[PDB]
């Protein structure tokens, strides 16, 4: 797991 990955909603949701 990456703590710096997107922590928001998936932009393609």
């Amino acid at each position: 797991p990456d703590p710096n990955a997107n922590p928001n909603v998936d932009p393609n949701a």
Epitope: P3, N4, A5, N6, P7, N8, V9
Partner: antibody, heavy 123, light 107 residues
């Protein structure tokens, strides 16, 4: 405009616990990752914790791991920091900070900060 | 968990000057560096993201450069509103900050 308003700071004795709150407006809070960051004059700015938009993933700074808990209530547009086993190191201004909201990059920092709430750990 | 070394700790400038602030990361961080401005009693404000991207509403006299480990914030034609403290932040591996640079008024 994005607005973040922290509350819950004050004087607390060493070893005790305290909960901070941050109320968000001006954006869809339930879609945003959120952080706490603290500031001292002598140590500068220090990241405390992050929580995913839906509360399912959390990470903590090494020196608060096992003592602090980050949580949120999306139905209330509110972020929380539960602090326990408080120490002198924990005296600071505590800021609520939104994770960077755009999607052009696949590594994420932070964009908008609140006004801060002060925590004084003292006997 | 990456150490950010910011220089200088303080610099003195006049309105109209060009100011440069450096930030060195202890390991490579690609372009994952941000610059913030902070005034006393106020919250930090994001100026530059992803090393060189000027954020919306931030004057064009702010610019950032660098990749890898060495980064620079440049403030051209320094204005009265620009006297403040500036911090870099890496967002490659968790989030850590430089120690700050205070830009004060020369007289």
């Amino acid at each position: 405009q994005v607005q973040l308003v922290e509350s819950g700071g004050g004087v607390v004795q060493p070893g005790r616990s305290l909960r901070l709150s941050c109320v968000a407006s001006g954006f869809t809070f339930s879609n945003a990752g959120m952080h706490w960051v603290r500031q001292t004059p002598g140590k500068g700015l220090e990241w405390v914790a992050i929580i995913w938009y839906d509360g399912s993933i959390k990470y903590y700074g090494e020196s608060v791991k096992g003592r602090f808990t980050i949580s949120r209530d999306n139905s209330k547009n509110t972020l929380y920091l539960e602090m326990s086993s408080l120490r002198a190191e924990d005296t600071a201004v505590y800021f609520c900070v939104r994770a960077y909201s755009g999607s052009l990059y696949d590594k994420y920092g932070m964009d908008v900060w609140g006004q801060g709430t002060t925590v004084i750990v003292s006997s | 968990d990456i150490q950010m070394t910011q220089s200088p700790s303080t610099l003195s400038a006049s309105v109209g000057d060009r100011v440069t602030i450096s930030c060195r990361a202890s390991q490579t961080i690609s372009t994952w560096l941000a610059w913030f401005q902070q005034k006393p009693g106020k919250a930090p404000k994001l100026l530059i993201y992803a090393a060189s991207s000027l954020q919306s509403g931030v004057p064009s006299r702010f610019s950032g450069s660098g990749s890898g480990t060495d980064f620079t914030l440049t403030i051209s034609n320094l204005q009265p509103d620009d006297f403040a403290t500036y911090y870099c932040q890496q967002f490659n591996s968790y989030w850590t900050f430089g120690q700050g640079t205070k830009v004060e008024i020369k007289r």
